Design a protein around this ligand. Structure first.
Ligand SMILES: Cc1cc2nc3c(=O)[nH]c(=O)nc-3n(C[C@H](O)[C@H](O)[C@H](O)COP(=O)(O)OP(=O)(O)OC[C@H]3O[C@@H](n4cnc5c(N)ncnc54)[C@H](O)[C@@H]3O)c2cc1C
Length: 369
């Protein structure tokens, strides 16, 4: 309760760790770079032991409310003809925006500052110094980075040899546009030239959430520039046909637009000194893994937990934090790489794989003494 803690960014894991920290007696603070939380995103499956975690946060019922209601989908060709349609445990498929908002609804007690960015971070035995972009300066006992795959807190506190970012050779994009098709609870996707386009409707009938997935070795100079992301999207899907151009034209007005390149972070240690990485920052499995959503839950839970049992000793708390998840992250990260290799109903062999990897770790209770 005494120690001053800082959580950076509102993700899944970012808000998740805050709630577990607050519930365990701590009083942390959450800061965010964007003016408000970013709700935009695709549907994500909460599964494995993460479903257990969702319940004890009391948000499981809210998740089942916002779960994907989409009834059907069919795989279109370039011309619109239908090649294939709709064919082929406690877990839920829910838009991360709903999940994030549900997570943000839980931590509402916890202070959250948006429009806050860290231009500098320093560390010694006594404290952790932070320099905000607005010029404000503060020192915390511990700092947890929710930044994710591209985390700046990782590059600042770590050198090049300590961690490595692995590129799985594919990109991903999604965003919300008004529905020109007018379809409701339907999903249309066409796979051509190792590229995929996905446009669908959901509980909100007005808007259709589009998406783009293509396998490429191309490297943007700066991956944080949206227009380079957007321009790169057009260049790749130029000549693709079908509904491509009609989607790209309604793109510019989408506020939730998200672009990135599938990658997974490999690090020996997820914590250095008084600073620790959570979520995609340290262990990110990447989108193709599909379990990237869950690692935030398992990580934010064990992180906050190990710090409480530490009784003030953070070094040991972080060492037990690293040791436990590496077994889980390893088996998990390798799944995302395996699916990254690929791209009948015998193919259900992969479904059995996920159920094995998702449940593959044992959570210390931390609740029951
Ligand atoms: C908007 C968005 C959309 C996504 N869509 C998909 C998807 O469609 N499919 C998929 O497989 N995965 C997607 N992901 C990745 C996936 O959701 C995460 O890997 C997973 O949920 C774990 O989240 P996290 O804890 O790493 O936080 P993340 O989801 O990585 O979010 C990090 C948050 O921290 C904030 N932040 C980042 N950098 C800084 C900084 N320097 N200073 C302050 N704040 C910062 C950002 O506002 C961001 O909301 C998305 C992530 C985001 C942020």
């Amino acid at each position: 309760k005494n120690i001053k803690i800082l959580v950076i960014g509102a993700g899944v894991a970012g808000p998740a760790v805050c709630y577990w920290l607050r519930r365990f007696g701590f009083s942390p603070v959450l800061i965010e770079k964007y003016a408000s939380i970013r709700k935009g995103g695709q549907a994500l499956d909460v599964r494995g032991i993460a479903t257990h975690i969702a319940r004890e946060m009391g948000i499981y019922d809210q998740i089942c409310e916002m779960r994907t209601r989409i009834e059907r989908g069919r795989f279109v060709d370039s011309s619109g003809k239908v090649l294939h349609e709709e064919q082929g445990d406690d877990e839920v498929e829910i838009l991360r925006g709903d999940l994030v908002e549900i997570l943000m609804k839980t931590i509402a007690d916890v202070p959250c500052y948006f429009n806050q960015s860290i231009i500098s971070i320093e560390q010694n035995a006594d404290n952790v110094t932070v320099i905000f972009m607005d010029g404000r300066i503060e020192q915390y006992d511990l700092v947890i980075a929710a930044d994710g795959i591209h985390s700046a807190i990782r590059r600042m506190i770590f050198e090049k040899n300590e961690y490595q970012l692995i590129h799985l050779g594919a990109y991903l994009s999604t965003f919300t546009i008004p529905n020109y098709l007018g379809l409701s609870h339907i999903d249309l996707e066409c796979e051509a030239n190792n590229k995929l386009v996905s446009i669908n409707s959901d509980n909100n009938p007005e808007i259709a959430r589009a998406g783009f997935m293509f396998r490429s070795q191309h490297l943007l100079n700066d991956i944080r520039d949206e227009q380079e992301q957007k321009q790169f999207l057009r260049d790749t899907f130029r000549d693709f046909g079908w509904e491509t151009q009609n989607i790209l034209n309604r793109m510019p007005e989408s506020n939730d637009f998200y672009f990135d390149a599938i990658t997974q972070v490999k690090m020996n240690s997820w914590t250095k000194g008084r600073i620790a990485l959570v979520g995609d920052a340290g262990y990110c499995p990447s989108p193709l893994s599909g379990q990237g959503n869950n690692l935030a839950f398992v990580g934010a839970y064990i992180l906050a937990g190990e710090l409480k049992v530490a009784n003030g000793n953070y070094t040991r708390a972080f060492t037990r934090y690293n040791a436990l998840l590496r077994s889980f992250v390893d088996a998990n990260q390798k799944f995302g790489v395996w699916v990254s290799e690929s791209f009948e109903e015998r193919s259900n062999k992969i479904l059995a794989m996920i159920k094995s990897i998702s449940n593959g770790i044992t959570l210390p209770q931390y609740e029951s003494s």
